[PDB]
């Protein structure tokens, strides 16, 4: 149509010209531009090349400025003009990013038009100090039985998902994102969790698959997907986690609660190493720069729970780390493990032995723990944790196998906390030792069906009260006894 | 002792020696004499016979130092430039000589107040319009400034003019406007 | 319908861009005048 392209597309275009402060490309190569001039450029300031490309000035040196290019250096030649933008790198933030797939700088890559964003936020902001924070109390529900019961996560926590390749880390993150739909459509506003998935160094078709999976479950309406894939410049993959963290800090600072997944931080470390080695900064261990720990700690400190004076919002962080051959002792894995508030260790042996999700409950710890659980979940899960430990000590034994086969879960099926509590109750009270370990799984399905067909009252009770009462204890007791008699 | 820094900065071996000479000459306020003497020694060494003899690594350093002493005393050079060439020949940085000169030159270029000015256009501009352009661009500078204008021509901008005054930059080429219209229509 | 609109609009943009390029000292006059208003 000749109206959508000319009514204001040309009528309003900011045709004015300005007196620009510029420099001149001395050299260009491998995404690094050494630029003469640019006297008044700031450190980490965003500059613009004469071909529309943008870069960030990282090495302020006496005779040149080292600029990392946010794109392909094919379009930059020696002698090109580099204009200042006067601003430190920032990205659009707000509610208008929900449902959109954007790149590391906030440009929509989903072919749906521009993000109608009016607020912008720096990517390198400082984390909140001691005073604005308060203890982590509200639970972040993942929908995964093993996590929600034995490695609970609160709102404002940093829980690391660490494991080998193809162990099920992205599956945990996506289950957690899908789970928040029960709360994001409800009426309680302080229970809604807006999700953010940062894809760093991934295949682009993998991100397309993930967005398809999130749209199938209708989870995209409250999810921002930041995508800096394998073909994107190393600066963009370096900057994607900070852009996502700014998009989440917007919610954190407004009384809302957000969840961010960094999938994964090993590839961000690789991209940062590339940028640093090409900026001629001296290498350290495994050629990584000296400040890779600072790279990840200044990022993972921005996940926080705020007190009431600052809105009461939160930002939960689920960084992902891929280890080689199970070497948790590597450089970046140990860095991120020392940073975060706990880890969820996934194993290949546990994966192939049928334990899915392959969470290693022996190693998986949540430094927040029961402080961020519901009372009902705590009641059942303290006993379940004790019995699973005692089973691991001798692997009674039949109850232990029952609980193990009860921790298994399908993919893309995050259960509600009430149904989780009912299942763990049925498993921890003896109602599962009369059945062989093989059939346990199917019973659960049937059980859930029954409970979600004719017993919505007890589930609503558990949901509202948060704890089980002795009355409701007896109710669910008799329900599960009758169902086991009929099963 | 405190060193006098030149108005512009140059780095490397050439920049360091040029800063040294600029400080040592501004102390004795003999900048123009050493400027002309550096041009003289540059024209001297650029001559191919000397440029081949004293730029030779398989002849002794002291022999070339003595020949440089000869060629700087015989041409009536100030003690400043004399022991400057002696220092260059002692450290072995004779190959950087021209560079030093160049550095020194551009220092004086901004000590006289000469700002570079590039005016790129699609076609050779008109002379009266060029005079008006120089006149109006005089207004972009402070006192004691002079445009050193080089109106190179690039016909790929399709019209207008791209002006760079030192590091200030106005992009009035019509191609920039058309690319902005394209980006506006596509976004 | 949506695809037709999208492709037709894209070719319209391409054609307008190609055809404005084919189409004055007044340009330089206004350029010098605006550089005078640079303050």
């Amino acid at each position: 149509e000749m109206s959508s392209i000319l009514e204001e597309r040309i009528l309003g275009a900011d045709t004015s010209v300005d007196l620009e402060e510029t420099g001149r490309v001395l050299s260009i190569g491998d995404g690094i531009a050494r630029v003469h001039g640019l006297r008044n450029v700031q450190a980490e300031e965003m500059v613009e090349f004469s071909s529309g490309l943008k870069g960030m000035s990282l090495n302020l040196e006496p005779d040149n400025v080292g600029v990392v290019v946010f794109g392909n250096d094919k379009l930059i030649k020696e002698g090109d003009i580099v204009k200042r933008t006067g601003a430190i790198v920032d990205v659009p933030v707000g509610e208008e990013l929900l449902g959109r797939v954007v790149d590391a700088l906030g440009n929509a890559i989903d072919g749906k038009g521009p993000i109608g964003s009016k607020t912008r936020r720096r990517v390198g902001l400082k984390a909140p100090g001691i005073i604005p924070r308060i203890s982590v109390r509200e639970p972040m529900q993942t929908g995964i039985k093993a996590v929600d019961s034995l490695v609970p996560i609160g709102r404002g926590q940093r829980e690391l998902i660490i494991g080998d390749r193809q162990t099920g880390k992205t599956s945990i993150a996506i289950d957690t994102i899908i789970n928040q739909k029960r709360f994001n459509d409800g009426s309680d506003e302080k229970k809604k969790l807006y999700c953010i998935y940062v894809a760093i160094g991934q295949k682009r078709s993998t991100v397309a698959q993930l967005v398809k999976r999130l749209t199938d479950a209708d989870a995209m309406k409250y999810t921002i997907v930041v995508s800096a894939t394998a073909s994107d410049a190393a600066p963009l993959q370096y900057l994607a986690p900070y852009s996502g963290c700014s998009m989440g800090e917007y919610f954190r600072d407004n009384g809302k609660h957000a969840l961010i997944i960094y999938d994964d931080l090993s590839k961000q470390a690789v991209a940062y190493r590339q940028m640093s080695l090409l900026l001629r900064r001296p290498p350290g261990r495994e050629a990584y720069p000296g400040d890779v720990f600072y790279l990840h700690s200044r990022l993972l400190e921005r996940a926080a729970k705020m007190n009431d004076a600052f809105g009461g919002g939160s930002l939960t962080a689920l960084p992902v780390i891929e280890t080689q051959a199970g070497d948790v002792s590597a450089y970046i894995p140990t860095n991120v493990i020392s940073i975060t508030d706990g880890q969820i260790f996934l194993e290949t042996e546990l994966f192939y032995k049928g334990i899915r999700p392959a969470i290693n409950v022996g190693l998986s710890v949540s430094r927040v723990g029961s402080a961020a659980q519901t009372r009902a979940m705590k009641q059942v899960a303290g006993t379940m944790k004790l019995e699973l430990a005692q089973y691991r000590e001798v692997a009674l034994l039949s109850r232990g196998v029952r609980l193990t086969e009860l921790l298994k879960q399908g993919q893309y099926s995050p259960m509600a906390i009430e149904e989780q509590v009912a299942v763990i109750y049925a498993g921890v009270r003896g109602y599962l030792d009369k059945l062989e370990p093989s059939k346990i799984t199917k019973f659960e399905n049937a059980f859930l069906s029954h409970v979600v067909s004719q017993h919505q009252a007890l589930l609503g009770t558990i949901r509202a009260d948060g704890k089980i009462s002795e009355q409701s204890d007896a109710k669910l007791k008799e329900i599960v006894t009758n169902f086991l008699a009929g099963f | 002792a405190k060193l006098v820094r030149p108005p512009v900065q140059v780095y490397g071996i050439e920049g360091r020696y040029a800063t040294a000479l600029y400080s040592a000459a501004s102390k004795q306020n003999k900048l123009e004499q050493v400027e002309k003497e550096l041009l003289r020694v540059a024209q001297i060494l650029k001559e191919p016979k000397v440029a081949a003899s004293v730029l030779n690594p398989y002849v002794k350093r002291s022999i070339k130092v003595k020949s440089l002493n000869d060629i700087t005393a015989k041409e009536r050079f100030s003690p400043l430039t004399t022991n400057l060439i002696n220092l260059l020949a002692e450290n072995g940085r004779l190959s950087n000589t021209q560079g030093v000169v160049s550095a020194f030159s551009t220092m004086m270029s901004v000590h006289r107040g000469e700002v570079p000015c590039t005016v790129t256009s699609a076609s050779p501009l008109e002379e009266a319009t060029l005079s008006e352009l120089k006149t109006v661009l005089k207004s972009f500078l402070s006192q004691g400034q002079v445009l050193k204008l080089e109106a190179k021509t690039d016909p790929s901008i399709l019209g207008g003019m791209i002006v760079r005054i030192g590091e200030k930059y106005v992009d009035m080429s019509v191609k920039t406007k058309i690319q902005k219209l394209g980006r506006a229509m596509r976004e | 319908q949506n695809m037709m609109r999208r492709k037709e609009q894209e070719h319209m943009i391409n054609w307008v861009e190609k055809h404005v390029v084919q189409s004055t000292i007044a340009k330089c006059i206004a350029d010098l005048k605006l550089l005078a208003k640079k303050a």
Binding site: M2, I10, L11 | V174 | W15, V16, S23
Partner: peptide, 15 residues
Amino acid sequence: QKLFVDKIREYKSKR
């Protein structure tokens, strides 16, 4: 105003 030239002339051409 060559941008307005683009606008007007190419609108009348596309029409």
